[PDB]
């Protein structure tokens, strides 16, 4: 068959961060030499695996979990990284197994009224487990200042958009963040390379 | 912080011109770049702007003079052509940086420079 | 897409200045702040005053403040000096090109 990374990098709209994609892909040649090689990427990792090795390895979860992020917090998608991200509206565990990938999107992603529908968590009253995506936009009590449901002073409306310019630095241009993510051994592999 | 520019300069009308300014004291890859003109007894027009790592180059419509404009970052660089050199085009111009993403911003300036359209 | 600006006033050292930026169409946007304040000396280029008018500033003095909401940003201004008045232009931003205000120079008699 073939794996739909040509629909996972290629689609049009990459959800927000907060809520992140989850796409499992299978039963497919999942071949990775059209990916690493179209070098447009402006930046790459890969973490339990070095990315050439894997054209000849088979596993059997893999999710491409793509979001949107804001330049400069790319460096905190990783494992080991705290901050307002990967604390957050989007962890990693440390142990991870697998690849990180960006490129600046600021020609689409970024209109001069500074697209707000690219919207993130900045209160959470906790800080994530691994690979908990949170939907609960319930308002923000700080205090102890009853918000009942409309917005307050010491209240918080959790999220927060990013202002977008195209014309931003390449801290505050929006990068394009997938990740990946697999299982390697022990569980037959609906996935493969060539 | 710190920038530079091309002096003033003559041209006939109707021809081109490429235009430079210089920058130094900062990542000129780091911050998108915009040209600005005065023309005298004219509020500020603005020219155009230029993405920070590869162009995003958008102008404003009016007519263009298919003004045409790049960075050439290892060397800190910005360039703009005018075209379609006319009377009113006489003005001064500014290179201009911009600043990380907000409201705006526009913060430091060149200097600015003098336009001759003439015979 | 239309910014515009008081013709002409005229001011003294001490009075606390307010310029009417006129905003045609939409007042600021949806972004909930944007536009700008500049200033032109004579002989030195403009320069950036607080932005979205909400903000800064670093070689600002805060004497210089302000806000700005609907089509009227609101220029705000104490005790200034004489040698400190420059034509102050306000950009529009996040729609349309920026531009910038037709202009207004305080002017000081005495």
């Known amino acids: 068959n073939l794996c739909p990374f040509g629909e996972v990098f290629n689609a049009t709209r990459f959800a927000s961060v907060y809520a992140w994609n989850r796409k499992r892909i299978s039963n497919c040649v999942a071949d990775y030499s059209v990916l690493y090689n179209s070098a447009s990427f402006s930046t790459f990792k890969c973490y339990g695996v070095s990315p050439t090795k894997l054209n000849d390895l088979c596993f059997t979860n893999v999710y491409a979990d793509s979001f949107v992020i804001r330049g400069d917090e790319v460096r905190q998608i990783a494992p080991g990284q705290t901050g307002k991200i990967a604390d957050y509206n989007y962890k990693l565990p440390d142990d991870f197994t697998g690849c990180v990938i960006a490129w600046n999107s600021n020609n689409l992603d970024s209109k001069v009224g500074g697209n707000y529908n690219y919207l993130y968590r900045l209160f959470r009253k906790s800080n994530l487990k691994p690979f908990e995506r949170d939907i609960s936009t319930e308002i923000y009590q700080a205090g102890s200042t009853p918000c009942n449901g409309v917005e307050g002073f010491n209240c918080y409306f959790p999220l927060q958009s990013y202002g977008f310019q195209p014309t931003n630095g390449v801290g505050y241009q929006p990068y394009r963040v997938v990740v990946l993510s697999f299982e390697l051994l022990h569980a037959p592999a609906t996935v493969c390379g060539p | 912080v710190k920038l530079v520019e091309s002096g003033g300069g003559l041209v006939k009308p109707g021809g081109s011109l490429r235009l430079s300014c210089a920058a130094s004291?900062?990542?000129?890859?780091?911050?998108?770049m915009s040209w600005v003109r005065q023309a005298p007894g004219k509020r500020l027009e603005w020219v155009a702007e230029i993405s920070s790592g590869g162009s995003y180059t958008y102008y404003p419509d009016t007519v263009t003079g298919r003004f045409t404009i790049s960075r050439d970052n290892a060397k800190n660089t910005l360039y703009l052509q005018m075209n379609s050199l006319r009377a009113e085009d006489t003005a001064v111009y500014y290179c201009?940086?911009?600043?990380?993403?907000?409201?705006?911003?526009?913060?430091?300036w060149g200097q600015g420079t003098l336009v001759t359209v003439s015979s | 897409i239309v910014l515009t600006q008081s013709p002409t006033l005229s001011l003294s050292p001490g009075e606390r200045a307010t310029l009417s930026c006129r905003a045609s169409?939409?007042?600021?946007?949806?972004?909930?702040?944007?536009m700008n304040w500049f200033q032109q000396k004579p002989g030195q280029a403009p320069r950036l005053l607080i932005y979205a008018a909400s903000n800064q500033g670093s070689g600002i003095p805060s004497r210089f403040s302000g806000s700005g909401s609907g089509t009227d940003f609101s220029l705000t201004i104490s005790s200034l000096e004489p040698e400190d008045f420059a034509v102050y232009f306000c950009?529009?931003?996040?729609?349309?090109?920026?531009?910038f205000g037709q202009g207004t120079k305080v002017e000081i008699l005495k």
């Open positions: 950009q529009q931003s996040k729609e349309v090109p920026r531009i």
């Open positions: 169409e939409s007042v600021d946007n949806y972004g909930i702040s944007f």
């Open positions: 201009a940086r911009f600043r990380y993403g907000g409201g705006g911003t526009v913060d430091y």
């Open positions: 004291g900062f990542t000129f890859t780091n911050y998108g």
